[PDB]
Amino acid sequence: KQLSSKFGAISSVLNDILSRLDPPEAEVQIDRLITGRLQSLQTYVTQQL
Amino acid sequence: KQLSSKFGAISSVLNDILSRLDPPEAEVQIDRLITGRLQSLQTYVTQQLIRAAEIRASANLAATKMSECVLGQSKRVDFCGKGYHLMSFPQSAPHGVVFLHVTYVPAQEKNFTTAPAICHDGKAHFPREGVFVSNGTHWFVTQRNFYEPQIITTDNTFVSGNCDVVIGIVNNTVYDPLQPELDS
Amino acid sequence: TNFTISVTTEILPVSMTKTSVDCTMYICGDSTECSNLLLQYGSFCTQLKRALTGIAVEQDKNTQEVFAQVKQIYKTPPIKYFGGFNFSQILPDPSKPSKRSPIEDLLFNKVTNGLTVLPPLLTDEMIAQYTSALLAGTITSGWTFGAGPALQIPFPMQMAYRFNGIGVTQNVLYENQKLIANQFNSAIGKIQDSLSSTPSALGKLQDVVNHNAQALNTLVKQLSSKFGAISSVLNDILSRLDPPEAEVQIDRLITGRLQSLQTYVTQQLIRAAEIRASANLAATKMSECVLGQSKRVDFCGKGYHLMSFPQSAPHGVVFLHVTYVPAQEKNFTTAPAICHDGKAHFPREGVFVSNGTHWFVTQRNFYEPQIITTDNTFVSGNCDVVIGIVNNTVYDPLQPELDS
Amino acid sequence: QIITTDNTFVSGNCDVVIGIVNNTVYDPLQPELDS
Amino acid sequence: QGVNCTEVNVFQTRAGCLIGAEYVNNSYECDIPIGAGICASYQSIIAYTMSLGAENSVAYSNNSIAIP
Numbered sequence: 001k002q003l004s005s006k007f008g009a010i011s012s013v014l015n016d017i018l019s020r021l022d023p024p025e026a027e028v029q030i031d032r033l034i035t036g037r038l039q040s041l042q043t044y045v046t047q048q049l
Numbered sequence: 050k051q052l053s054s055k056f057g058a059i060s061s062v063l064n065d066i067l068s069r070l071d072p073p074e075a076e077v078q079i080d081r082l083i084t085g086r087l088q089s090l091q092t093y094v095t096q097q098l099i100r101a102a103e104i105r106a107s108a109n110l111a112a113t114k115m116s117e118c119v120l121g122q123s124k125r126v127d128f129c130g131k132g133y134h135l136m137s138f139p140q141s142a143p144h145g146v147v148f149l150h151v152t153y154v155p156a157q158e159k160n161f162t163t164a165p166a167i168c169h170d171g172k173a174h175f176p177r178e179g180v181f182v183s184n185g186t187h188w189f190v191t192q193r194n195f196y197e198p199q200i201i202t203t204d205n206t207f208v209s210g211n212c213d214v215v216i217g218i219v220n221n222t223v224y225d226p227l228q229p230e231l232d233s
Numbered sequence: 234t235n236f237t238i239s240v241t242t243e244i245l246p247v248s249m250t251k252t253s254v255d256c257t258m259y260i261c262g263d264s265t266e267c268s269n270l271l272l273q274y275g276s277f278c279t280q281l282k283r284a285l286t287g288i289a290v291e292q293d294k295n296t297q298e299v300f301a302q303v304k305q306i307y308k309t310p311p312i313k314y315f316g317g318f319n320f321s322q323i324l325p326d327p328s329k330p331s332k333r334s335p336i337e338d339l340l341f342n343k344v345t346n347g348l349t350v351l352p353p354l355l356t357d358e359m360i361a362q363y364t365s366a367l368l369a370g371t372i373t374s375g376w377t378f379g380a381g382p383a384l385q386i387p388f389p390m391q392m393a394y395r396f397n398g399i400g401v402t403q404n405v406l407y408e409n410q411k412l413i414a415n416q417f418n419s420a421i422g423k424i425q426d427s428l429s430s431t432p433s434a435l436g437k438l439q440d441v442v443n444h445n446a447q448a449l450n451t452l453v454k455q456l457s458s459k460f461g462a463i464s465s466v467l468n469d470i471l472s473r474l475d476p477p478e479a480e481v482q483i484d485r486l487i488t489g490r491l492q493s494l495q496t497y498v499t500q501q502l503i504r505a506a507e508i509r510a511s512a513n514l515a516a517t518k519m520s521e522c523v524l525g526q527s528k529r530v531d532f533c534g535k536g537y538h539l540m541s542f543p544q545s546a547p548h549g550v551v552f553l554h555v556t557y558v559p560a561q562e563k564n565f566t567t568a569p570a571i572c573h574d575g576k577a578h579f580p581r582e583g584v585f586v587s588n589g590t591h592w593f594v595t596q597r598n599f600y601e602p603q604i605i606t607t608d609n610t611f612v613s614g615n616c617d618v619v620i621g622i623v624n625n626t627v628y629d630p631l632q633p634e635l636d637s
Numbered sequence: 638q639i640i641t642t643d644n645t646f647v648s649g650n651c652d653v654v655i656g657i658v659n660n661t662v663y664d665p666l667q668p669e670l671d672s
Numbered sequence: 673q674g675v676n677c678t679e680v681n682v683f684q685t686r687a688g689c690l691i692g693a694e695y696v697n698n699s700y701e702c703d704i705p706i707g708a709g710i711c712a713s714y715q716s717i718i719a720y721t722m723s724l725g726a727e728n729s730v731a732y733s734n735n736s737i738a739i740p
């Protein structure tokens with residue numbers, strides 16, 4: 001369920017955000033998106049531990 | 050106290066940010082405040098979960114102690130009190146429990162001379178439940194945790210083996226109660 | 234009809250390495266701009282420092298709780314003759330200047346910025362002294378010294394007590410004391426020879442040391458991570474880029490390093506909780522299987538429990554359980570009750586065992602046949618209600634006693 | 638069960654045990670020594 | 673913590689170096705931990721080696737028993 005959240009970025013799809021936006025700001029947007037996804041994964045791993 | 054931290058935003062007061070800024074920049078200020086406070090809340094929930102797991106383990110141990118030292122007597126040494134354990138009383142406490150272990154602690158020891166077994170008429174004798182304790186002249190049996198000498202009687206001793214395989218024995222007669230009983 | 238004493242070892246970790254961190258030194262080091270920017274994040278230093286000091290205090294209490302169970306340091310007598318039991322592989326040796334037993338030496342030889350390591354409160358010599366005192370107390374005073382004052386008990390006598398505690402009377406130890414002494418010495422020799430035979434024997438201590446070292450190495454390795462910035466040096470970004478972009482780059486670096494530090498703190502907290510649970514288990518085993526004899530089956534060693542000894546280990550404890558394995562069995566034919574003169578008979582503490590022609594009563598764990606007598610039997614009921622009964626005579630001493 | 642000397646053991650005197658009662662105790666080997 | 677203080681009553685431990693407390697030859701039972709078994713207390717402030725307990729020696733023989 002957390003895989004398909006916007007995480008404060010423009011979109012939540014890789015192909016949608018790596019095509020329309022310019023790479024100088026698309027890099028920052030996808031950096032924020034993968035930071036949010038990594039935080040969610042870390043929370044899941046801590047819960048499983 | 051994490052509410053007053055700015056988290057790299059313009060200000061910590063949220064209504065000030067919403068009342069001083071247009072939504073194009075209020076969006077990113079809101080985003081920074083949300084991610085900072087969410088990280089703080091995640092840390093708080095993780096620490097609370099760890100402390101609750103620790104309290105769960107301690108309460109499981111306390112429940113085991115209550116079930117094994119109030120509802121009964123536990124024979125294992127130094128689980129409830131420092132010494133032989135008799136019984137215990139629970140007492141209520143705010144956010145916890147307090148026990149009152151009642152323990153049996155021996156004191157005032159006394160030196161004695163012993164021997165593993167006594168040989169009499171070629172057959173060895175052994176203590177049924179005690180130990181052969183001699184004060185220097187005579188020999189008595191006694192229970193292992195309190196001094197209470199008794200005369201060596203064949204009812205509380207049992208015979209096994211010969212006089213040679215057993216080591217460290219001593220020479221003493223054994224009082225047989227039937228022999229003077231049949232003499233009257 | 235025979236018994237074999239086997240010595241088995243189990244290893245439990247007690248406490249791992251204490252760790253304390255510095256916030257500004259690890260995160261910034263020397264740049265005062267980072268120190269100014271860290272104050273914007275609030276109180277993400279006092280929480281981590283308090284958590285790690287709590288971990289250090291908890292591990293100190295862990296290493297104190299499992300060993301400091303005696304209030305008097307007991308001295309082993311200089312003579313080492315206990316009745317045939319060669320207790321030289323675990324008692325301390327004055328020849329070694331470290332007060333180290335050969336088992337302790339074999340165990341000790343088989344274990345290999347901003348991150349300081351606090352030394353433990355108890356050094357190796359003091360925990361060695363506690364283990365020596367505990368071994369002396371359990372070798373010369375029985376299990377009494379864990380309750381009150383220590384009382385001088387001869388070693389065969391308390392060994393006979395430990396046999397009497399497992400349902401076997403003390404008429405089996407004094408007859409083959411040489412054999413049981415030889416078996417005990419061979420068991421100690423073979424456990425000394427096979428303790429270092431496999432490198433996977435000391436699994437847990439090497440594991441906890443290896444995880445601690447790898448966690449600290451992974452924490453140090455995160456300093457050379459770009460974290461999406463231009464470089465991983467605080468001095469490089471500040472002296473090359475303009476401050477509007479330097480602010481964003483430094484903020485990204487700080488949030489990445491703070492996330493790494495939080496992950497390491499959570500991992501350390503989980504590991505310390507697991508080590509504390511194992512230390513509570515080790516403390517229960519210390520207070521139960523060393524200070525006394527425990528009747529729980531398969532809790533200390535694979536078999537009936539007699540006694541066990543502690544040995545000091547680097548960042549842990551190592552036990553030497555002494556079990557009682559009754560091998561070489563021989564089966565018979567039995568009956569639950571004996572009928573005589575119309576009234577039933579029951580065994581007082583043993584079981585009625587027939588070898589085919591005659592009948593005998595014997596103990597529950599050692600084939601020592603005795604003639605059935607009215608002193609170690611009691612009567613109850615009649616011969617009809619009880620099932621499986623057999624017809625046999627019972628010896629009574631009054632019948633030859635009276636006519637004499 | 639009938640109270641005998643087989644399932645009892647003697648100790649002390651009849652002056653310190655609080656709550657003691659008066660009763661005779663059956664003894665074995667009685668209809669045996671005189672027959 | 674872990675500083676050989678030659679660049680800053682000064683006593684040196686294995687956990688670092690201590691300033692403001694002296695050393696005592698005899699050993700007392702301690703309450704405040706430091707590290708490496710050098711406890712500090714307040715009788716001035718003194719620092720000593722940790723007392724391991726009373727050095728009680730129990731006799732031993734093969735024909736000697738003790739009964740409380």
Ligand SMILES: *[C@@H]1O[C@H](CO)[C@@H](O[C@@H]2O[C@H](CO)[C@@H](O)[C@H](O)[C@H]2NC(C)=O)[C@H](O)[C@H]1NC(C)=O
Pocket residue numbers: 184185186187
């Ligand atoms: C060891 O204990 C026995 C048992 O009390 C002592 O024997 C008694 O000695 C007194 C002193 O004359 C006599 O009056 C008693 O009649 C004795 N008891 C019996 C049952 O005969 C013995 O003296 C003690 N020995 C030592 C060295 O203390």
Ligand SMILES: *[C@@H]1O[C@H](CO)[C@@H](O[C@@H]2O[C@H](CO)[C@@H](O)[C@H](O)[C@H]2NC(C)=O)[C@H](O)[C@H]1NC(C)=O
Pocket residue numbers: 168218219220
């Ligand atoms: C108890 O007294 C008897 C007395 O006969 C001792 O038996 C003698 O023991 C010596 C040495 O063991 C032998 O040389 C004799 O031949 C034995 N005599 C007989 C008639 O067998 C016995 O050893 C004594 N027990 C102890 C433990 O001292």
Ligand SMILES: *[C@@H]1O[C@H](CO)[C@@H](O[C@@H]2O[C@H](CO)[C@@H](O)[C@H](O)[C@H]2NC(C)=O)[C@H](O)[C@H]1NC(C)=O
Pocket residue numbers: 234235236237409412415416
């Ligand atoms: C019980 O087992 C032990 C060994 O497990 C037996 O002791 C051996 O006895 C033979 C004699 O036939 C000796 O050659 C061996 O050296 C003994 N072994 C050891 C380790 O000393 C013993 O005989 C068996 N039976 C009884 C009744 O104890």
Ligand SMILES: *[C@@H]1O[C@H](CO)[C@@H](O[C@@H]2O[C@H](CO)[C@@H](O)[C@H](O)[C@H]2NC(C)=O)[C@H](O)[C@H]1NC(C)=O
Pocket residue numbers: 217312313314315733734735
């Ligand atoms: C009690 O223990 C002592 C040792 O503390 C025994 O002394 C031994 O005596 C024999 C005599 O042949 C020597 O061979 C041993 O070498 C001595 N002990 C040692 C150092 O091993 C004494 O014999 C024991 N007495 C008993 C068995 O009651």
Ligand SMILES: *[C@@H]1O[C@H](CO)[C@@H](O[C@@H]2O[C@H](CO)[C@@H](O)[C@H](O)[C@H]2NC(C)=O)[C@H](O)[C@H]1NC(C)=O
Pocket residue numbers: 319320321322422
């Ligand atoms: C107890 O056992 C140890 C080990 O079996 C004995 O130590 C051996 O002693 C002999 C003779 O001094 C040496 O040749 C061996 O190399 C030693 N072995 C080890 C592993 O050190 C010790 O002598 C025994 N003690 C008694 C009293 O029997």
Ligand SMILES: *[C@@H]1O[C@H](CO)[C@@H](O[C@@H]2O[C@H](CO)[C@@H](O)[C@H](O)[C@H]2NC(C)=O)[C@H](O)[C@H]1NC(C)=O
Pocket residue numbers: 588589590591602
């Ligand atoms: C069962 O055990 C009994 C005694 O434990 C055995 O009886 C003994 O047998 C030997 C062998 O001839 C005789 O020398 C003894 O006199 C017998 N004891 C007596 C009669 O009290 C018996 O043989 C055993 N049965 C089997 C099948 O092994």
Ligand SMILES: *[C@@H]1O[C@H](CO)[C@@H](O[C@@H]2O[C@H](CO)[C@@H](O)[C@H](O)[C@H]2NC(C)=O)[C@H](O)[C@H]1NC(C)=O
Pocket residue numbers: 622623624
């Ligand atoms: C033990 O002996 C008694 C002797 O009375 C046996 O009881 C008799 O058994 C026979 C055969 O089954 C019956 O016909 C009788 O009626 C029984 N009499 C009584 C008074 O019970 C008994 O069977 C024997 N038990 C065994 C196992 O042999």
Ligand SMILES: *[C@@H]1O[C@H](CO)[C@@H](O)[C@H](O)[C@H]1NC(C)=O
Pocket residue numbers: 158159160731
């Ligand atoms: C018992 O004897 C030993 C050695 O003779 C001695 O050290 C000890 O103090 C004695 N105990 C008492 C209570 O006298």
Ligand SMILES: *[C@@H]1O[C@H](CO)[C@@H](O)[C@H](O)[C@H]1NC(C)=O
Pocket residue numbers: 564565566
């Ligand atoms: C049990 O005893 C019988 C003879 O009484 C024998 O045939 C059988 O092998 C024995 N069982 C075992 C497991 O040894």
Ligand SMILES: *[C@@H]1O[C@H](CO)[C@@H](O)[C@H](O)[C@H]1NC(C)=O
Pocket residue numbers: 676678684
């Ligand atoms: C501190 O440094 C001096 C000189 O470098 C050295 O002699 C001393 O041993 C050092 N302290 C410790 C505890 O090693």
Ligand SMILES: *[C@@H]1O[C@H](CO)[C@@H](O)[C@H](O)[C@H]1NC(C)=O
Pocket residue numbers: 695696697
């Ligand atoms: C403690 O004793 C040692 C050895 O006698 C001595 O060198 C040292 O100075 C003593 N400590 C103090 C504080 O005097």
